[PDB]
């Protein structure tokens, strides 16, 4: 909150998690997500205001938003690959490879549709890191200091669009459009969470203790 809009953006861009590679389709996706979670934890600690929160609140936020963060990251990575989802540079999945897992292709379709939406809106990297930080902070509120940070990212988003050359009317319109996407990202997460728990109960794939706990919170 003592950061400028440009400092806010630069700090978020600098805190970006690395793109990992993949090492049984569910096995590959589970293994990838598990290794990504560790890098997500360190990422969250670099999100302005997150370490200021009580540790109990930090747990709760990550438990609620971890799949949303993985999904929006995936959607961001797949923007330059239409009709495909880039889980990893060595794991570029076309739509039809979602048919490999039961009830997976409709999750892919929503992820692909989200990527095309970011593409049509010409989403910027600066806007992306803001949206991802918003997800982390907002997705567990309805379960003071958090809302003032959220208002800071809102100011930051507006500053970006104003700096990008958008008129005042285009700013709050685009701001609305970006935040309305988070509702769909929320939807995908809940469906993905139900699917992941479905795979766990059918013994489709072994889950790490970290992932088990992530599912338990839902």
């Amino acid at each position: 909150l003592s950061l400028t809009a440009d400092q806010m953006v630069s700090a978020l861009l600098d805190a970006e998690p690395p793109i990992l590679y993949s090492e049984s389709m569910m096995g590959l996706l589970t293994n990838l997500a598990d290794r990504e979670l560790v890098h997500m934890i360190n990422w969250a600690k670099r999100v302005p205001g997150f370490v200021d929160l009580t540790l109990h609140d930090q747990v709760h936020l990550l438990e609620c938003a971890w799949l949303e963060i993985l999904m929006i990251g995936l959607v961001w990575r797949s923007m330059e690959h239409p009709g495909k989802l880039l889980f990893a540079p060595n794991l570029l999945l076309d739509r039809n490879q979602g048919k490999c897992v039961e009830g997976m292709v409709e999750i892919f379709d929503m992820l692909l549709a989200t990527s095309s939406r970011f593409r049509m809106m010409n989403l910027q990297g600066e806007e992306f890191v803001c949206l991802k930080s918003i997800i982390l902070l907002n997705s567990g509120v309805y379960t003071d200091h958090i809302h003032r940070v959220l208002d800071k990212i809102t100011d930051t988003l507006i500053h970006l669009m104003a700096k990008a050359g958008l008129t005042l009317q285009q700013q709050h319109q685009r701001l609305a459009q970006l935040l309305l996407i988070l509702s769909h990202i929320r939807h995908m997460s809940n469906k993905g969470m139900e699917h992941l728990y479905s795979m766990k109960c059918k013994n489709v794939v072994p889950l790490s203790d970290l992932l088990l706990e992530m599912l338990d919170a839902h």
Partner: peptide, 8 residues
């Protein structure tokens, strides 16, 4: 407790 420990 699990996550509770990587934020140490």
């Amino acid at each position: 407790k699990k996550l509770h420990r990587x934020l140490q």
